[PDB]
Design an enzyme around this catalytic site. Structure first.
Site, PDB file in Angstrom:
ATOM      1  CE  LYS A 135     -11.804 -10.601  14.478  1.00 15.72           C
ATOM      2  NZ  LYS A 135     -12.816 -12.075  14.187  1.00 15.72           N
ATOM      3  CD  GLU A 190      -6.551 -19.897   8.147  1.00 15.95           C
ATOM      4  OE1 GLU A 190      -5.836 -20.718   8.604  1.00 15.95           O
ATOM      5  OE2 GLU A 190      -7.587 -19.578   8.275  1.00 15.95           O
ATOM      6  CG  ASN A 207       2.197  -0.903  13.720  1.00 17.20           C
ATOM      7  OD1 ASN A 207       1.811   0.156  13.709  1.00 17.20           O
ATOM      8  ND2 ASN A 207       2.509  -1.566  14.797  1.00 17.20           N
ATOM      9  CD  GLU A 251      -4.740  -0.858   4.034  1.00 17.53           C
ATOM     10  OE1 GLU A 251      -4.109  -1.881   4.534  1.00 17.53           O
ATOM     11  OE2 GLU A 251      -4.692   0.110   4.125  1.00 17.53           O
ATOM     12  CD  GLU A 276      -7.472  -2.356   6.766  1.00 14.47           C
ATOM     13  OE1 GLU A 276      -7.856  -2.808   7.987  1.00 14.47           O
ATOM     14  OE2 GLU A 276      -6.629  -1.195   6.478  1.00 14.47           O
ATOM     15  CG  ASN A 323      -8.710   3.226   6.211  1.00 13.72           C
ATOM     16  OD1 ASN A 323      -9.784   3.725   6.913  1.00 13.72           O
ATOM     17  ND2 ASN A 323      -7.601   3.655   6.352  1.00 13.72           N
ATOM     18  CG  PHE A 365      14.594   1.474  13.417  1.00  9.11           C
ATOM     19  CD1 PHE A 365      16.039   1.128  13.084  1.00  9.11           C
ATOM     20  CD2 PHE A 365      13.490   1.290  12.492  1.00  9.11           C
ATOM     21  CE1 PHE A 365      16.118   0.875  11.769  1.00  9.11           C
ATOM     22  CE2 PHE A 365      13.803   1.247  11.350  1.00  9.11           C
ATOM     23  CZ  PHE A 365      15.158   0.997  10.767  1.00  9.11           C
TER      24      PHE A 365
END
Ligand code: BTN
Lengths: 247, 673, 261
Positions: free
Chosen positions: B122, B206, B241, B281, B294, B296, B354
């Site tokens: 990262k 941030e 997620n 993204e 990011e 991918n 869920f």
């Protein structure tokens, strides 16, 4: 419910290796009209399944081996329950469909002292004395005298089928190879040849013991054909007041 | 496209499921030999049967079945295939696989390892993004040791946003930034918490992503320095997620923002000398200010929706650029054609936790391929088995139209006409999400299902009109079955005198209420009076079809009958939800009042051996969770091994069974709560 | 060179001697006697007409088509005779050759004798000591059993059937005496079981013997499979003869009436 609908879910219902079981009720549900099945004494002698269903609108009696319970071997209670169901079904002009997957009879001294010979004879008599049309499907295995008991061809059978996973033999392969080739010790030769020559329906198919080897997904249609031809079946037998069933 | 161009001769697909099927289909279209690989349990899968050659790799557990480097390399050497498509997942982003495979002069359909390694970490990826003149989170990255420093950073970089604390978050100084008072408060709180655990009293600011929306840019680039952006996607509807529904075009951003995102993604892809396909993204807030998230570098699961908007085929284009051929289409060629929506249908219960996964076998399986504007991407067929070793994904439905409303309508139609019997799925949740009030208008956030359903999914709440429609349909179906039970053949010895019933009076128990219904038949039309409300139901009344299309006083409905009993119980799938109903006549309704209520006792938490045998091996560990249907232990008897499944999920109080132990009938094995 | 009449004579006395004098000596030292002696002791002198004496099995697999294992008759003696003047059909299984196991020819001869009995309207006596079914023949043997079974169920209530077991019957053979109207045993040298003690030990691990699991005492005192037990072969045959005197010949005929004082 169309009579020629296919059942692709039956192509891989039977597991590839022979030590794993499957539900025979799933096959019956997939084959009969609208997946409706009236089962008789479902909680007693669960080794075997008997019940009433419909094929193309016509009432059919259903007999099947249950590999989930006691490996599907024949018993006392199973023999008596199947015999009474088959006798009523034949006495009141109702066709029979049987699904055979059986390795033999339950061993033990309790079955031997209880008279398992008499009750096995009861089931054999019920199948052999029937006059209504009957159709047999061999799914995985049929060993020994259990093969003859459970609605065989030579007991005046009408239509007999075998799935590509069916194997028919006098007994297990290991026992046969160790009681045939005993004088000279063999390593992997006799076993391999016997497995590749007799672990399949071909020794029964070459002798006309089974009509055909059919794909599972086409079973129902074929059954619906046979009944359509077999409704005109009539036989004659010698005169007799009544028979002596081994009661 | 012209298959006469020189392309590869054999392609080996190193994946499984629907991605393998998609790659095989594209290769067959291109006119290429295809090789497949499979596990032992997957010998009868669809991708195994469609491919020309299938090579087994080993056991069922994927940890050493589909990731066996040596077995795959041996299969490559045996089959003499000069190219491999990894799809997505498994070994698609594996440096070791690529370096091992590059030695035998076999090309890799995918990006070079430099892109993978530059996206793996990262910090250096963020540094490269800073170099790539692409905007990131403007968050402060320095040190704040006192409150005046906090207010200074607040007035320097702006203060509308939540605070961060470098090392530390989620309560560690997390303050909503509108004024300096929360600067001081967050400073003191974060400093104390760091002095306790973290040790760094510094603070960061941030910028917020409050009400976030996830934007994806699909980028395709050859090895000659040409890169293209393929519009955007929105994937903001998630549980645990994991996305459930996606739509390629987004109403949130206008043309200028789309162009800005496309140019930034193209620049970033060019900076790393990218090849094949990838995705960038971003996260966007309520003021349309995109922030980098990011990159991918791999084919995405939700790729085909973009296809429906552009008409391209990603697999063939990437396999072409794998050989070195430059990409054909220019930037001005790409355009937007309509709207598209994709829904992922899993094998999991949507009511409990869920999305709890479930296993089983498919009794019967049908998909609505004949409906307009619907495509299905699936890797299962009727009779397929849902295993515990793999993803419980069943299929994905993609629906395209001229605009958003047409796509949503067609997706609802497709969802209502889709048969899955044998396992539990999440069709109800998707069907209810599509017709949500704030989803249609376009107010989708990342916390959609979190705040729409505070107490979890409870099915579809049907209004009084829909309740009346359901009651009328159920009464008409009951009467249709009762009338069919009268049609016999001609006997000519004891004729059947058909009973004549002017109207049927029924007591219908639904949920916790009982309604009174009067149903009359005039051929194929039923007149139903429900508490004085008149309705007319017309249908073909084919009682054997899995689907049933009825027309209740003008409105067309599609229903499924899942179960039916002689005691009056029915299960009706209506508007995507399953309703259990009890149907009785008058006479039985008054005669049932005098029937004593038999109390029923069930445990479902104690495991008893039905037959004696020997436990070969225990497949569970105390203190774990077990799905409904997962086998707990296996006991062999008379050479046959019997799998003892489960019926619920609970806490294991104690274990009374061990591997290799001989047990009898009725012995206690496992006790749950 | 040699004529065919001498070959016929050679075949004839091979069939009379059975499987050899050493095997007959072993049979006699076991405590029991042979099939021909049983038939001569059950029927009137000079009334036995053997049917279909020259039969050789058809099985070329597993190297059993050599001359060392060719046996005319093939482990069964079938025919018709008379008891006190009334006609009867009889089959007796021979334990000497190949252990008395069922083959195609064995089953074919038994089926033919049963068909003749049902046609004429005369009873059937069966004398059983068989080791089961041939494994070398395989699937062909099972079919034979089924044929026999059919005939049994066909004749039930039409002609009386009598079963007498003088040796270790096992396998599916045990199901033929079960369909028979009456089943008699002989003490200490006769067994009946579907499964032997070795498979029982392997599966359900109880230690049993052949007498305890299939003996005459077990089947005449606790299982209700047999109807009577007799000390040895000779008195068993005598009691068979007078029991036959009790019974009629077919369901068409009335119950017999004897001159009385
Ligand atoms: C183990 O020795 C192999 C299987 C044991 C015999 C099995 S058990 C049940 C069936 N009935 C029978 O007589 N043989 C079969």
């Amino acid at each position: 419910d169309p009579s020629d609908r296919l059942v692709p879910e039956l192509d891989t219902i039977v597991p590839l290796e022979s030590t794993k079981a499957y539900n025979m009720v799933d096959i019956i549900h997939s084959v009969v009209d609208e997946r409706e099945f009236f089962e008789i004494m479902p909680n007693y002698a669960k080794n075997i399944i008997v019940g009433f269903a419909r094929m193309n609108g016509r009432t059919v009696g259903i007999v099947g081996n249950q590999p989930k319970v006691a490996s599907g071997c024949l018993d006392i209670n199973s023999s008596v329950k199947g015999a009474r169901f088959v006798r009523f079904c034949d006495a009141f002009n109702i066709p029979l469909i049987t699904f055979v997957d059986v390795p033999g009879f339950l061993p033990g001294t309790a079955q031997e002292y209880g008279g398992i010979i008499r009750h096995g004879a009861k089931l054999l008599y019920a199948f052999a004395e029937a006059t209504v049309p009957k159709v047999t499907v061999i799914t995985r295995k049929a060993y020994g005298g259990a093969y003859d008991v459970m609605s065989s061809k030579h007991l005046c059978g009408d239509t007999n089928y075998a799935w590509p996973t069916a194997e028919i033999a006098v007994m297990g392969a290991k026992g046969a190879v160790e009681i045939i080739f005993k004088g000279h010790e063999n390593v992997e030769a006799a076993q391999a040849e016997y497995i590749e020559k007799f672990a399949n329906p071909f020794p029964a198919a070459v002798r006309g013991f089974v009509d055909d080897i059919i794909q599972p997904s086409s079973t129902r249609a074929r059954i619906c054909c046979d009944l359509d031809v077999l409704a005109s079946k009539k036989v004659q037998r010698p005169w007799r007041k009544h028979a002596n069933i081994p009661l | 496209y012209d298959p006469n161009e020189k392309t590869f001769d054999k392609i080996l697909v190193a994946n499984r499921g629907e991605i393998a099927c998609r790659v095989i289909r594209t290769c067959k279209k291109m006119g290429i030999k295809t090789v497949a690989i499979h596990s032992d349990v997957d010998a009868s899968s669809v991708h195994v049967k469609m491919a020309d050659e299938a090579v087994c790799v080993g056991p069922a557990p994927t940890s050493k079945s589909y990731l066996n480097m040596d077995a795959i390399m041996e299969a490559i050497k045996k089959t003499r295939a000069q190219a491999v498509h990894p799809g997505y997942g498994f070994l698609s982003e594996n440096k070791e696989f690529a370096r091992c495979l590059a030695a035998e002069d076999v090309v890799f359909i995918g990006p070079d390892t430099h892109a993978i390694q530059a996206m793996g970490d990262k910090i250096e990826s963020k540094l490269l993004a800073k170099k790539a003149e692409v905007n990131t989170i403007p968050g402060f990255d320095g040190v704040v040791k006192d409150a005046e420093e906090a207010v200074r950073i607040a007035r320097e970089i702006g203060y509308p946003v939540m605070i961060k604390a470098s090392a530390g978050g989620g309560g560690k100084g997390m303050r909503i930034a509108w004024d300096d008072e929360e600067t001081r408060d967050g400073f003191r709180l974060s400093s104390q918490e760091a002095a306790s655990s973290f040790g760094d009293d510094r603070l960061l600011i941030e910028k917020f992503i409050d009400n976030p929306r996830h934007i994806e840019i699909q980028v395709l680039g050859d090895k000659h320095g040409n890169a293209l952006w393929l519009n955007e996607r929105e994937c903001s509807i998630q549980r645990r997620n994991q996305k459930v529904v996606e739509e390629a075009p987004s109403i949130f951003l206008d043309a200028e923002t789309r162009r800005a995102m496309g140019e930034q993604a193209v620049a970033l892809a060019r900076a790393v000398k990218y090849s094949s396909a990838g995705t960038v993204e971003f996260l966007v807030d309520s003021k349309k200010n995109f922030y980098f998230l990011e990159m991918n570098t791999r084919l995405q699961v939700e790729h085909p929706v973009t296809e429906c908007i552009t008409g391209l085929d990603l697999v063939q284009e990437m396999i072409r650029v794998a050989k070195g051929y430059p990409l054909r289409h220019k930037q001005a060629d790409i355009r937007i054609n309509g709207w598209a929506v994709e829904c992922r249908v899993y094998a999991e219960d949507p009511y409990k936790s869920f999305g709890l996964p479930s296993i089983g076998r498919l009794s019967q399986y049908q998909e609505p391929l004949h409906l307009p504007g619907v495509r299905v991407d699936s890797g299962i067929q009727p009779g397929s088995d849902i295993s515990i070793y793999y993803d419980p994904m069943i299929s994905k439905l993609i629906t395209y139209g001229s605009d958003r409303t047409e796509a949503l309508k067609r997706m609802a139609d497709a969802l209502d006409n889709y048969v899955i019997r044998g396992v539990t799925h999440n069709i109800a949740l998707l069907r209810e999400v599509i017709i949500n009030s704030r989803f249609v208008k376009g107010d989708i956030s990342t916390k959609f299902l979190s705040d729409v359903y505070p107490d979890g999914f409870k099915g579809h709440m049907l209004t009084k009109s829909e309740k009346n429609q359901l009651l009328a349909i159920a009464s008409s179906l009951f009467v249709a079955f009762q009338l069919r039970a009268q049609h016999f053949q001609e006997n000519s010895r004891m004729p059947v005198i058909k009973p004549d019933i002017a109207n049927w009076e029924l007591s219908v128990k639904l949920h916790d209420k009982v309604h009174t219904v009067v149903a009359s038949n005039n051929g194929s039309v039923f007149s139903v009076e429900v508490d004085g409300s008149k309705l007319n139901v017309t249908s073909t009344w084919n009682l054997a079809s899995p689907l049933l299309s009825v027309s209740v006083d003008g409105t067309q409905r599609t229903v499924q009958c899942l179960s039916r009993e002689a005691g009056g119980n029915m299960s009706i799938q209506f508007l995507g939800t399953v309703y259990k109903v009890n149907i009785l006549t008058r006479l039985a309704a008054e005669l049932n009042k005098f029937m004593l209520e038999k109390v029923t006792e069930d445990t479902s938490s104690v495991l008893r051996s039905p037959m004696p045998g020997v436990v070969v091996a225990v497949s569970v560990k105390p203190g774990d969770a077990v799905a409904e249907g997962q086998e707990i232990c296996v006991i062999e008897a008379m050479k046959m091994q019997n799998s003892m499944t489960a019926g619920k999920t609970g806490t294991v109080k104690s274990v009374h069974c061990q591997a290799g132990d001989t047990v009898g009938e009725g012995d206690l094995l496992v006790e749950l709560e | 060179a040699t004529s065919v009449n001498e070959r016929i004579e050679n075949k004839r006395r091979t069939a009379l001697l059975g499987g050899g004098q050493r095997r007959i000596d072993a049979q006699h030292k076991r405590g029991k006697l042979t099939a021909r002696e049983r038939i001569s002791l059950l029927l009137d002198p000079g009334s036995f007409v053997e049917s279909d004496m020259f039969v050789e099995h058809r099985c070329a697999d597993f190297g059993m088509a050599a001359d060392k294992n060719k046996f005319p008759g093939d482990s069964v003696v079938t025919g018709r005779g008379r008891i006190n003047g009334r006609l009867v059909y009889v089959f007796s299984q021979d334990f000497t050759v190949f252990g008395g196991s069922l083959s195609g020819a064995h089953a074919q001869k038994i089926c033919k004798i049963m068909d003749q009995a049902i046609t004429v309207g005369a009873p059937v006596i069966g004398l059983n000591d068989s080791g089961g079914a041939r494994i070398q023949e395989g699937v062909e043997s099972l079919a034979g059993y089924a044929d026999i079974f059919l005939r049994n169920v066909t004749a039930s209530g039409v002609i009386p059937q009598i079963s007498l077991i003088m040796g270790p019957c096992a396998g599916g053979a045990v199901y033929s005496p079960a369909l028979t109207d009456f089943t008699f045993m002989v003490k200490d040298t006769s067994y009946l079981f579907i499964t032997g003690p070795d498979v029982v030990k392997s599966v359900t691990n109880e230690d049993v013997t052949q007498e305890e699991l299939g003996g005459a005492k077990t089947h005449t005192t606790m299982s209700g499979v047999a109807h009577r037990a007799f000390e040895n072969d000779v008195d068993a045959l005598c009691n068979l003869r007078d029991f036959f005197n009790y019974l009629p010949l077919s369901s068409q005929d009335p119950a017999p009436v004897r001159e009385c004082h």
